[PDB]
Amino acid sequence: MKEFYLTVEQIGDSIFERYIDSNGRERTREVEYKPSLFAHCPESQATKYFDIYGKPCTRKLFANMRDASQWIKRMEDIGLEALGMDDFKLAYLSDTYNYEIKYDHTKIRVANFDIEVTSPDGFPEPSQAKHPIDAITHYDSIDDRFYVFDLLNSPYGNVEEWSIEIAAKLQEQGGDEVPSEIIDKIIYMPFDNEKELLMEYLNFWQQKTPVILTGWNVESFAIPYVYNRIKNIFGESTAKRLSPHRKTRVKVIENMYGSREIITLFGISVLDYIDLYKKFSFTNQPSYSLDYISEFELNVGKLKYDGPISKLRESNHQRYISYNIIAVYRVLQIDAKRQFINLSLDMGYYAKIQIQSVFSPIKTWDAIIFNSLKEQNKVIPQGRSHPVQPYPGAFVKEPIPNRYKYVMSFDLTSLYPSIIRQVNISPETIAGTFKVAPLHDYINAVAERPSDVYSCSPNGMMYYKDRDGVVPTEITKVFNQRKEHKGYMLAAQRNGEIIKEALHNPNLSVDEPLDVDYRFDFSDEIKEKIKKLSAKSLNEMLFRAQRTEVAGMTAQINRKALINGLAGALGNVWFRYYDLRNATAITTFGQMALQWIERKVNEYLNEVCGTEGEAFVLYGDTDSIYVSADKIIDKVGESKFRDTNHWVDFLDKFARERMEPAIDRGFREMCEYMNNKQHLMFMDREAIAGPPLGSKGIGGFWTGKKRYALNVWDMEGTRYAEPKLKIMGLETQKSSTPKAVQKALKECIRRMLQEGEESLQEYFKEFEKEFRQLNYISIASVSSANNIAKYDVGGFPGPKCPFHIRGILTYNRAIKGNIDAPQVVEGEKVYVLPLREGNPFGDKCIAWPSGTEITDLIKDDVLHWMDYTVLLEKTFIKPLEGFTSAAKLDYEKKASLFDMF
DNA sequence: TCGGTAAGCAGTCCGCG
């Protein structure tokens, strides 16, 4: 097999590399790598190395990496550019793996672990590590085993061994329900003392050294705790055995308001799963406890126990250990679904970076561009210091707030990357500038044509047309990968809808789910077989189709995020290729493209309808337009359609056969006007929306910019079994909105769009009457909580104290003195409830850590004093009033002359 | 929360005769 790296580090003058050799074995080597850097040289000097602008360079080979670093410093002292890859390990990988890396995940040791630490006096601080580690569960992907290290004797209690037999039993048998599929994979090791436990764990780690190390909060808790505890008991040298090269560093992570410490383990790649999830999931959750995320992702129930976690080991050691094991498994289950480790490996090996560097789009693109340029013996520029400067972004149209009955939307494919490719925007393709007219003049095609030679953006920049820049070349490669995965995602989505339709008529039989590839549209033969399947088999197939869609979504949306990240990196001062001329060339071209095509679409539809000056485009944001289709439907007449699907078909065909060719002609003209390199503005129909045929539903409404709701029948070629609400920006979509209120507001919207005013009034009346019975957690608001200290004046709110922070201060006074009460953590999320006048907490609200029940001490008083009237007005009535006023509807029935009968 | 801009709403403070 072809060799591939696992990890790489620089330690002084050596590169330490772990890798898989040509025979598939894991090896380690230390290499005295001699790096090269570059200086500009005279034109009359033979070289094969050129910078990105075509100026000749001489290569300087150093005796060691320290010599190279010192040379960079002296070049700064002189005032001359020091060119080349200054991150020597990236250069090492580029020289050692000079081909497209083909990796074999089965050879990569991925470890998932979790620790338990009993603590009487609050949260066990990892930097102190003053309490025994009393359990470790460590799953190894190569062994496919859960290694369980269990402390039986502690200063906080002596316990009996954990029983695998009880662990396996149902909770209704008094068991812990450890999933049967992992029971045979557990290797249980009990210990008489903590010193022996940790010594054995280190010997185990030496034998089975993680390449990828993951788990939940491992970077901020488990790793520093284990390192510091071993340090405290045995000394520094022993703790450093967690690194295969015996090297560690305390790293200070700084933010806006403070800092924290993590431990860097040289020769390991730590990918904390909470951080993978936050980067790659595109969710914003009210809590990031593993129980909360597990319930959201997997629909598994919360891990139930009695009393505080600090007393769990002593009271129920059996459950304590089972729950440690289950926590490790839940992370593996989330990854089986979301496939974030797979994604990280794919992108890391593609770029040729340390795998943990996938968190940084700047580092990722630096490496991709470096490797690409090196292939042509070109030499990268030195990174420079720049002051942070604001720059302009997208255009968003101000919509007229209203109901909109029939709507079709259109959207540009991969806009910012397509602009980069069309215009040919790159550091080395800058050709010069032209004299800019107001943007309006380009939009309306009255400005002078910018150039007869170069490719232009309306910010004034011109670009070469003779050859593609490196940024367009490399962005195209990742875009093509994205396109492939998006295809699989959409096919799985369409396949899912076929199964949903079939589920209306399930067959009374015993059979099996079909063995199919859900990434490809079902054949006619498969469709025929599906129509004969049982509900059991169909539901299994739906679950599998949906898992295939999730896998495709992970792969496509994150490749989209990477290519959009390159457009953004051009506007980040830490990027080697930072240039506001290029960042603004992208965003300004986008503003023009949207407004240009709004004009062309209005012109086309006014012509087909025989009117003048009427606005068909009701809204647009960045690269999308929303078109009123009422007049199109009315030209046919509603009574002429057989059912909803009939007019949906008609609009689908109108969009494809009439509107898209008109849009294409419009953009081709724009490409010629700007003299661009290649026409790549591809705007296809996205949504077809409207009320059910014959209903009193309103179809859709807008309240303002980035705030609308549509009843959608077809999305990007997926024809839904049931209409789907597309809601953007409204409170239903915000993590700050109470869970039960999101649900109620969504039902109000559904009723408005699908059924009409009377239906809305009926539901509102019921919600208002019953909502006080809702569980307190479900009606609590949520907020991140920063700067608690800034606003705390002797335990009371200082000037301008935010509402949620006020709630935290209230909580802190109520729990004062208690060492075991859950503390609110700076920067994390809290639940918030309003309090009625004259409550014993002495303020108008209270807040506590999100994802948790409020502590028993004050729970009774919180429930008794919760202000339901304020809660309802603020979270439900006010947003609903906004929706209904915009849609010209009433949520309460107004008096009529009929009330007289 | 270590890792592009536009823009909405909640809440504080305070003016507005």
Next chain:
DNA sequence: GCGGACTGCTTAC
């Protein structure tokens, strides 16, 4: 009471 200046937080792209 509602709007502007401002902070804080959270979305849509």
